[PDB]
Amino acid sequence: KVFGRCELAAAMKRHGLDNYRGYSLGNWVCAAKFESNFNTQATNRNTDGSTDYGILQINSRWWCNDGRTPGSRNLCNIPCSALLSSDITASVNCAKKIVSDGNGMNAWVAWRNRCKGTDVQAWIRGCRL
Incomplete structure (x- = not known):
């Protein structure tokens, strides 16, 4: 499913990501x-042989099982395919673990390189939330 911006904002807020581990909805x-x-x-396949899955590109080395990432963990206890659903519940539950793991949202390199330090409130502009 390709979410609209405000549609995703509303779903992420319903699932408890607004201000989760101190990160406002616009960051997510x-x-x-x-x-x-x-x-x-x-x-998206990574150089190390892992793959990133779903709306938050959660990686198969640590977080989900894809059956092809040797010597990996599955700390979210899900198949990586669960992260491709139109239902974002599994991605949100796993994101909550990842952002709790010590480095916060720096775990996402698109967030660190394109969102961190920017006007992230712009991403929820116009939304009725």
Whole structure:
């Protein structure tokens, strides 16, 4: 599913990401924009052999099982395909673990390079939230 911007904002807020671990909703919307272009089906292979999955591009080494990332963990206890659903519940639950892991949203390199330090409130402009 390709979410609209305000549609994703509303879903992320309903699932409890606004101010989760102190990150305002606009940070999460900005992260999704630059990780996946709001596309739940996005996948991207990494140099290390892992793959990133879904609207927040969650990686198969640590977080989800894709069956092809040797010596990886599955700390979110899900198949990586669960992160491609139109239902973002699994991606949000896993994102909450990742952003709690010590480096905050720096775990997302699109957030650090394109969102951190910017006017991230712009990403929720116009939305009725």
